[PDB]
């Protein structure tokens with residue numbers, strides 16, 4: 001009773017915080033025309049992904065945990081899973097796109113204005129969501145992701161129970177498409193950006209003989225990794241070895257991954273312009 | 283009456299398409315302001331490259347240098363127009379430490395301080411060219427005129443350990459001029475804009491490459507400081 | 513001898529002005545009712561410039577307006593339907609002023625280059641390119657379709673004839689580079705103010721300066737002229753905007769607040785003259801009760817400094833152009 | 844150049860002046876007389892307003 005009440009309170013606070021932060025950043029971008037910028041379109045895409053997260057898959061999963069069973073229909077189990085995968089992969093790929101945009105802005109400043117335009121920004125944002133949809137809705141709404149052993153068939157036949165059972169192929173493919181490839185891209189581009197920042201710091205020191213880069217990249221990489229790496233590692237493991245990972249650990253790591261959507265406004269919208277916009281909004 | 287509205291909408295669409303093309307053209311190029319004294323030798327630099335504009339490109343990047351001259355006024359208010367420029371190129375003669383037309387160097391330092399300490403030019407970086415190094419070397423090497431009389435602070439100055447030299451005395455003088463400019467550069471700024479002191483002679487033809495590199499550094503540092511990376 | 517005589521005569525001018533001020537404007541004004549709060553909402557936002565806007569001019573018809581920016585374009589707007597009627601490419605990327613001819617046939621622009629260009633809309637080719645100034649132009653106005661007055665970065669303000677392209681008269685005797693200019697609604701008189709803290713009234717026909725007003729402390733950036741033709745308000749880099757009177761020959765009221773420490777870039781008057789709208793260096797512009805000298809409202813919708821402000825002839829709307837690309841029309 | 848300045852100041856000296864009370868009264872009378880037909884001063888009706 002008290003233990004369940006605590007989980008309910010924590011999940012309610014989490015969903016409230018996620019929704020509030022994401023609607024705040026979205027309405028700040030929408031209301032003020034100064035915030036509208038090529039990178040802010042990617043920020044808006046990420047905020048929309050986190051908002052649909054907090055609206056659809058956080059409270060439904062909270063109900064699925066607090067109450068033992070899935071009251072809603074089996075089709076709605078499939079739809080909730082599809083929306084969850086869509087939101088996760090869209091958020092991670094949008095983070096990768098933002099990292100790529102920063103890398104292009106810093107590495108090739110002269111051509112950066114040509115490479116990234118409003119029309120190209122819209123094309124990239126739609127392409128990200130198209131990839132996310134082809135990753136999530138296409139294999140899950142249809143019966144591709146369903147496993148073959150007896151447990152998966154029993155779970156999928158019963159309408160009251162809604163859990164996650166997945167083929168090796170789809171588990172590996174979803175993990176690679178969602179996290180590991182964006183992880184590689186983001187790590188590479190941020191290593192290049194850190195090298196450029198260190199080079200400029202050395203140039204300034206050499207010119208004016210009379211730290212900051214480490215903290216920013218540190219938090220940007222650390223939050224995303226500490227939120228999502230354990231879940232995707234156990235996503236690989238639980239199908240590489242069936243008995244390795246228990247269900248409760250898997251769900252807990254999945255929710256720690258969900259928590260990342262709340263932290264995105266704090267990391268990617270701390271600029272003084274955003275601070276002034278938030279002050280004006282409230 | 284709806285026909286007039288439709289025709290006006292078509293004209294608006296055509297004008298908007300032309301404006302988009304002009305935006306693609308305009309956002310690509312970079313605009314520079316050339317700002318120096320008349321005797322500084324800016325003519326030499328602009329040649330190697332009421333208002334004079336020069337279109338010079340390098341590495342497929344279009345630079346637009348707007349040298350303003352003939353509007354010789356102590357009060358410069360057209361300077362507020364050059365708030366969106368990539369950089370302000372400053373040309374100063376470093377061989378004029380003893381010319382009163384107080385000294386030319388002191389007038390140039392006052393101009394540099396006024397430009398640096400401008401509310402509108404807070405974010406604009408200044409590329410500094412210390413022209414006429416050969417004449418300065420000839421003047422200091424002769425020893426007829428000593429900087430100590432015109433600049434008392436030249437005394438008690440030793441050559442910086444981290445220096446890239448040539449005669450020791452002329453190098454002392456050159457780095458004194460650089461430090462005199464860089465003190466004004468660093469005292470007021472908060473990291474938004476920097477100064478890039480370059481030593482140029484009338485013979486040097488690589489100033490285009492130097493301006494290209496300095497503009498690249500300026501935009502790179504601007505992007506790095508827009509984020510918390512620097 | 514001559515300098516001492518000039519100093520004594522300036523003392524006499526000051527004494528004569530002081531002897532004519534029995535009571536201030538606020539003493540008489542404070543009895544009448546205040547204007548009250550004024551709420552103004554951005555009805556239409558004009559988009560399409562690429563760089564900062566310096567000046568605009570409402571057409572004689574309340575709809576059309578023309579604005580120029582450092583982009584290098586002179587866009588003519590249809591404020592009723594928000595459609596770019598014309599977009600004129602410019603020879604020089606830098607422009608400091610605009611002008612809409614009373615007939616609507618011609619449009620003039622001035623740049624940081626010493627040359628102003630007059631465009632024939634109904635024909636968008638350069639009808640005439642007027643040169644002769646030795647400094648940047650700050651403001652241009654149209655008397656008729658053939659006579660144009662320009663104020664430049666030298667001392668002189670000049671009156672041109674477009675057909676012959678010649679400086680008919682030169683208004684000299686000023687001290688600093690002229691930054692503002694305005695015309696009498698029907699009379700030949702016009703006024704101009706510059707960096708020296710002095711706004712001078714001129715006579716177009718005679719070509720001489722009748723009166724000079726030196727109330728301000730810093731450079732004057734804008735002048736609007738009262739609809740009566742018997743007053744004009746100046747804006748300076750000090751926070752004060754001041755209302756001068758031609759017949760009294762000295763200032764009547766000052767518009768400033770302790771909180772505001774930024775300068776004023778453009779001022780204008782309401783059609784009844786009660787509301788002195790002033791555009792400040794901070795990102796918003798303010799509305800003053802020209803009689804009570806107290807603030808009536810504020811217009812805060814701009815992301816950068818308000819470089820130009822104007823009120824249409826009918827008085828329906830106020831359009832302000834800031835250093836961001838957007839023109840905003842308030843009402 | 845001082846001769847031109849002193850001549851201009853002398854020309855400015857011989858101009859008639861009216862008391863500030865009269866000028867302020869004229870300005871107040873004008874602002875009262877033209878107050879009614881000011882769209883900015885009195886919020887215009889939505890039907891009469893062209894922009895909105």
Ligand SMILES: CN[C@@H]1CCc2c(ccc(O)c2O)[C@H]1O
Nearest residue numbers: 084085088089164174175178254
């Ligand atoms: C039920 N929750 C889902 C299940 C599997 C999965 C998630 C997120 C991203 C992916 O690429 C996945 O394959 C999780 O949020």
